[PDB]
Symmetry: C2
Subunit: 237 residues, 2 copies
């Protein structure tokens, strides 16, 4: 049984209470919702271990999405941050502004999106797990994961040093590849990993360029505040 | 840094390495979809993924990678990361959405189960193999935790395949690029390598056999094992 306040009249983005370490994945779909101006609700999950939530996301994490299918026949779900970006782009990015307009654009977008999904994303998550959450400290494992993060920054830096390559996938504009990468490739996160972000200057310039976008600013503000307003958990007003 | 003499792009070129039990579980993924769709393609066996010319194709310096002609045939494009090679082949060659998804509903579940593999089981399996075989020092506590995380991913797949009529991971009716991406890390041989009893996940085992019975999957496994063991060891294989 779902909570009484969980209804799907539009896209519902599932998040947790905003903290330094709880927002770096949930901010990704929120950035794209803000960029495209998609109507949406915010549901603050008290416990991702709740049986009702595992029916939405079997991996028992945020972000997750419930939405009405375009024909209204089904309730659709998206879970895994990369999948939430793919879903929003499919349903709402009509012109492929962030999803890609043609096979050539999508070939590069999917390369840099998947690189984050498979390499930096999971490496960063395992680094955080062993550094903070694992009952035993395994410094040899932590150091190897930190080393792997620097290799991923090296790859992103190489790409952004190519002539006229202002963004990761396309030269001209940011895509879901850029949105997926940003939260794990910015000064604050680099400092958490114990890295000097200035040692990747084109990657830092790129992170500031993305950070100056109004949709990205709004997304970061809102994800920090969720659960700290008038309502702590459930459907926000 | 100059491309080898025998590297030309007159059609889709799939970059692989010499076939072994632990060198084919990512390269087999695009090869399965190519065989399912009957896409014309060449095979290029890379001797050293560390070679500068190869890093210009895949900056992550791994297989699989693809070079192909653009739709209009005037330009060359690239796909790298196994999940990206599946998304590209589906975009360029699966116009009926048989494996890529025909509508927003289908693609929502395809992308959920494809991304779950790309983010969770795939990278966890890769880290497991790295610490087990490749890392200069054995870290058994790390290896054990990664092995435990694999069993959690198996539990999720088992739950999905226990749902009424859910014959495949994403769609009830047919396999998709989600199923193709998952199969190589969710079959008896790979489970045995991880030191797991695959029988503990009966619906997952039944699914792996159902996928394995497909003629395109049989052709992919037989071919990927042989790359680099034929009359030509490295470079562009003769079709
Ligand atoms: N692979 C997932 C990871 C998401 C993730 O790590 N979410 C955290 C943010 S706090 C979570 O749900 N953790 C809550 C918990 O398990 O306590 C993605 O990229 O979406
Ligand atoms: N995340 C990548 C991983 C691919 C991967 O692990 N590739 C290995 C398989 S052998 C590789 O290229 N190794 C080169 C070598 O050492 O021969 C994907 O899913 O495509």
């Amino acid at each position: 049984e779902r909570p009484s306040d969980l209804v799907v009249n539009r896209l519902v983005l599932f998040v947790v209470k905003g903290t330094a370490t709880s927002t770096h994945n949930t901010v990704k779909p929120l950035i794209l919702l803000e960029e495209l101006g998609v109507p949406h609700d915010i549901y603050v999950v008290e416990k991702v271990s709740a049986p009702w939530f595992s029916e939405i996301n079997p991996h028992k994490m945020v972000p997750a999405i419930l939405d009405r299918s375009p024909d209204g026949r089904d309730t659709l779900r998206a879970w895994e941050s990369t999948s939430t970006l793919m879903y929003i782009a499919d349903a709402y990015d009509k012109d492929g502004t962030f999803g890609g307009r043609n096979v050539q654009e999508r070939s590069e977008i999917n390369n840099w999106l998947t690189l984050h999904t498979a390499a930096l994303g999971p490496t960063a998550k395992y680094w955080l797990y062993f550094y903070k959450l694992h009952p035993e400290k395994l410094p040899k494992t932590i150091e190897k994961l930190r080393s792997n993060i620097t290799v991923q920054y090296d790859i992103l830096e190489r790409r952004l040093n190519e002539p006229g390559q202002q963004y990761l996938a396309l030269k001209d504009r940011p895509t879901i590849a850029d949105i997926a990468t940003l939260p794990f490739a910015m000064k604050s996160t680099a400092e958490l990993f114990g890295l000097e972000f200035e040692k990747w200057p084109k990657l830092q310039e790129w992170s500031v360029r993305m950070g100056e976008r109004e949709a990205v600013k709004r997304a970061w503000q809102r994800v920090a505040g969720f659960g700290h307003g008038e309502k702590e958990y459930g459907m926000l007003e």
